[PDB]
Amino acid sequence: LHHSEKKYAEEDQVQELLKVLNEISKTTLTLDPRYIWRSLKDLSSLRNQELLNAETLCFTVNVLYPDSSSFKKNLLKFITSNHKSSVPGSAELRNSYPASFYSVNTEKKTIEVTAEINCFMHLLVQLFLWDSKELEQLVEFNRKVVIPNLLCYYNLRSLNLINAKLWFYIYLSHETLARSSEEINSDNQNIILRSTMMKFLKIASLKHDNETKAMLINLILRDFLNNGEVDSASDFISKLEYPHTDVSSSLEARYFFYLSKINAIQLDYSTANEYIIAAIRKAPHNSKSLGFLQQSNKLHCCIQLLMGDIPELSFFHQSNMQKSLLPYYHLTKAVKLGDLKKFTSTITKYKQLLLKDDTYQLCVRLRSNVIKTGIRIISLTYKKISLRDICLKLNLDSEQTVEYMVSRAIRDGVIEAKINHEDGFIETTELLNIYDSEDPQQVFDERIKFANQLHDEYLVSMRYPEDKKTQQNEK
């Protein structure tokens, strides 16, 4: 029973291992194993539940263990190990074959097979930790191991793609430990975590690995948003080390999402409005990306309201996620009509729900835009309106107060009007008739480069896959 369960999963694990083993030996095929490693994460997670945990025990006995004998016992110690044929050396699949890691040449240390075996061993360990939700001592113990090992080994083009996915588990397992319980050991552990990311990021800079630098930047930018340091986030994004070529669309959407929150506090909403739109287009529409689409769609509504523009109501209607978008709908109506008591009671009841995503702190800045939008509505309907006529609409304090809210408006060129005090009314300065000026021609020249921007990323990408057609033989 238990014997047939251990040998079945190990054969499938070696079968997937031999596919990426022969591809890294000859020249550089490394682009190919990257596609296999995408499905390796999903196929291993479903396989971990079946045939219990014993698939990883016989795999370590098969190959040579540099560090991995005591790590399995420590991993099995927390789960109250059940010992069945647990003596090392019970299962031997090598049987002296070249693709099986021939034992005599391996045990005599005349050849080194540890490079691809050890780096692959740490990957399967991190998969079971996230599946079994093992925390506390097992989180810190594995962090003290993998990091010094990566500094000792010299990573090639294919080796840099191994640990590229391991850095995500280091930051993920560290944040789940802090949110579960707060302790002095968690704050000091985060200090080493921050200094470690910057040391390896410099290593990947010389190797110019696309997937490695894409995973690190996404983890580093998130650490800046938690601490809220402006000087660290602004200086990091000025280097522009993020490759846009071979990185996945899921890694791209996460990058544009960080730039929207950073530029939101910089009081420049022109660039931040484009970054939140590009993050939606790059993110897939499947169910696994709904977690990113849920947070990104909530940030888009906050960026629009801070620009003075009001987002469409169909976004809160035709979508299927509007159940969580209900708090933002009442904020939309309160800004339009400019009601004083409507916004106060709106943010009071939902104060608890908006605290989770930290979007309630941005609602304080939304209060200023409540009247600023109402001023734009009354200014477009009335070209010349008396000073006392505005206070009768929005029920403001006094005519002395409303005069200075239009002040903050046209400083940046929002309303584009003038206040005549002697005449006693506010007149709109826009005469339209701007088609004959050269101001539209400035934007017109940008649309030519936008269509030309699609050339170099396209015409060059035709022959890119085509080199395999002429080299391979055809019927």
Binding site: E182, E183, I184, D187, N188, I191, I192, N226, N227, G228, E229, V230, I265, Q266, L267, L340, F343, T344, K351, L355, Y360, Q361, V364, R365, R367, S368, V370, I371, D397, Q400, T401, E403, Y404, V406, S407, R408, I410, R411, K418, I419, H421, E422, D445, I448, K449, N452, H455
Partner: protein, 272 residues
């Protein structure tokens, strides 16, 4: 000004007795013993020192040192306290003895951020205490910078601007940045009639900016550098010039033709 044999005790004694100029002369010798034992910042490892020795006193040493430098208007020294106060009220979990202790310390750094009219580093800096609506807006203590934010709940800025006159916390400690905010607010109020509105009235500006005397209108125009004529104030600065040198920016003359020619040549080079 030395008092007792202990350097740490002389800083607190000379703090409440006045003479903040000579009180800062004892800062260099105090930092000699603190850097040697690394008591200014908590170490990464566990030294078995949390509330013992002088490590708990370092919060009080840097507190009276920052309160002395804020009155003398020292930006270089006050920056050193906040960077050393940065790990404080963070490490040692959520509780030490009195928790936040006195509220007259932290409120000074956030008040200086509003003096420069900078909202970028204002809200973003509280992520260490990670409460904008609780440790700040809900906090009753050190409410002078808080109430200006509290008036933004109902959306009335006028009382927040009039708070500086009616506030009870602007008397002694916060008086340093009180006149700075009052000048910064009143400037932004009058900047609408500067670059756009042409001719300003005379007796009406008295009632707009809340002047008790008619001569205060002309006194405000002296610091703003505005021309004064009979019962009117004009603005001749609409056309900006000089400001070092500018090439191919903001509507040039000879280089503007090249910019148009360059934009038309970009589509030709891509097509070819």
């Amino acid at each position: 000004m030395p008092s007792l044999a202990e350097l740490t005790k002389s800083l607190s004694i000379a703090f409440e007795n006045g003479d903040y100029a000579a009180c800062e002369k004892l800062l260099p010798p105090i930092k000699i013993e603190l850097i040697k034992n690394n008591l200014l910042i908590p170490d990464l490892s566990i030294q078995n020192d949390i509330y013992l020795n002088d490590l708990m006193i370092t919060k009080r040493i840097l507190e009276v040192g920052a309160l002395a430098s804020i009155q003398t208007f020292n930006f270089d020294s006050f920056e050193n306290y906040f960077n050393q106060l940065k790990p404080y009220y963070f490490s040692n979990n959520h509780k030490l003895s009195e928790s936040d202790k006195k509220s007259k310390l932290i409120s000074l750094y956030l008040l200086n951020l509003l003096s420069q009219n900078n909202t970028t580093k204002f809200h973003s800096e509280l992520q260490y205490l990670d409460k904008h609506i609780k440790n700040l807006e809900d906090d009753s203590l050190l409410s002078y910078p808080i109430k200006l934010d509290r008036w933004l709940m109902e959306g009335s800025y006028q009382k927040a601007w009039d708070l500086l006159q009616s506030g009870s916390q602007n008397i002694s400690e916060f008086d340093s940045f009180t006149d700075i905010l009052k000048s910064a607010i009143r400037d932004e109020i009058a900047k609408n009639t500067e670059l756009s509105y042409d001719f300003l009235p005379l007796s009406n500006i008295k009632a707009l900016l809340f002047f008790n005397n008619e001569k205060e209108t002309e006194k405000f125009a002296l610091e703003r550098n505005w021309p004064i004529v009979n019962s009117k104030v004009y603005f001749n600065n609409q056309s900006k010039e000089k400001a070092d040198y500018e090439d191919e920016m903001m509507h040039e003359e000879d280089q503007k033709t090249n910019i148009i020619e360059k934009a038309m040549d970009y589509a030709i080079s891509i097509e070819n």
